[PDB]
Design a binder for this molecule. Structure first.
Ligand SMILES: C[C@H](N)[C@@H](CCCCCC(=O)O)CC(=O)O
Ligand SMILES: C[C@H](N)[C@@H](CCCCCC(=O)O)CC(=O)O
Lengths: 219, 219
């Protein structure tokens, strides 16, 4: 299986929008696809337990029919850092459970997209971060950049930290989080120049069928 | 002279609020102080030329009477990345002019605070970033963290990049950018654990005399 990890420059950059566009283009290329979000916080109660909306989006954009707990093993109600609510609730987030879940998807999908929570360094416990599990798994990383003032700094910080860990930065996606602004073209040129990985495509400001904005031939 | 560079985790984290609190505590410890903001964008027209409000704050919080152009040599009207507006206006931002300005302040001040623009990696030209000038100058760095969801990731990214460049991370300041929230104490404990530098103090949410929140004995 092809496997990619998706991270973002900050918490509200539309990372799941880019993950659904990636899943839609891979489906169009003929892959049997699966979205995986191992850890999620900020969830609603239903008759079946807590459900996170980003994980629901990954589940409905996967080409395989998948059960929710296969897509998202760890679900917390409160929208805070996973290591705070994990400790509060008394439910440890285990690296072995996160990796088993990935293997179970590779039994049926040949293109798997793994979406983290937050940015690169989100803590999962007091001694373990999301970056430690991605490094452990040796996943190639796709960086989603929300295009706004301040994003050059955040895209460069994330790119250098991933490369320092010896991981491949597979590419980046530009998400237009605001309407067209004055320096949009100069920001896109600077970001293309500075991020050492191919620009996979740009998704326009939308306040759903977005696969056409991704060029999968660059991954 | 003691010299410190101040940077922030993102663009609106109240970095100049923390710089004024630092200048106020150094003045109270008996230092002859000077604030320096070499590059600024987002400025107003006056009879005397363009004036940036952050640079004005540094100027009025310095214990020496200083002229504006001594505090801020490069002033651009439009609030965008300095390398975009510098190219548009045809006014190169020169490293020699930025360093000369710092020397001129050391002629009269014995505690100098240098405030950058944006975050760590702000571009000054197509081949030069603010981080290259700070590394060139070998300034110790003070990191200002706006405490909100997403700041653990940004504080860790900035801290590792500075240390990788071989610079000293002198300390960090927590700025409360919102009213008291649910996980404020757990966020402060996590940030203290993870940032490899002393917490210099915490400034409370204020919608001016803030020197009392800084412990200069840790710098
Ligand atoms: C206009 C802002 N307040 C600030 C510059 C932000 C540059 C951001 C570059 C990037 O995208 O990383 C200007 C200033 O602080 O004087
Ligand atoms: C609740 C958020 N949407 C998100 C977690 C953000 C953690 C931020 C940690 C940090 O401060 O860096 C949860 C999620 O995406 O499922």
């Amino acid at each position: 299986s092809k496997r990619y990890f998706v991270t973002g420059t900050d918490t509200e950059v539309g990372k799941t929008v880019a993950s659904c566009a990636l899943l839609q283009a891979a489906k169009a290329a003929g892959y049997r696809t699966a979205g995986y979000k191992p850890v999620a916080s900020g969830s609603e109660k239903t008759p079946e337990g807590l459900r996170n909306s980003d994980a629901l989006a990954l589940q409905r954009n996967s080409s395989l029919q998948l059960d929710y707990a296969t897509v998202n093993p760890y679900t917390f109600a409160e929208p805070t850092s996973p290591h705070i609510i994990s400790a509060q609730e008394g439910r440890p987030i285990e690296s072995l459970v996160m990796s088993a879940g990935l293997r179970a998807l590779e039994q049926q999908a040949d293109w798997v997209l793994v979406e983290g929570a937050g940015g690169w360094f989100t803590p999962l416990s007091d001694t373990f971060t999301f970056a430690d599990w991605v490094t452990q798994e040796q996943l190639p990383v796709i960086l989603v950049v929300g295009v706004k003032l301040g994003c050059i700094n955040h895209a460069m910080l994330t790119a250098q930290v991933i490369q320092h860990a010896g991981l491949t930065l597979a590419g980046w996606v530009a998400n237009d989080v605001t309407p067209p602004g004055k320096r949009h073209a100069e920001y896109m040129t600077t970001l293309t120049r500075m991020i050492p990985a191919p620009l996979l495509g740009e998704i326009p400001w939308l306040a759903a069928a977005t696969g056409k904005y991704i060029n999968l031939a660059l991954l």
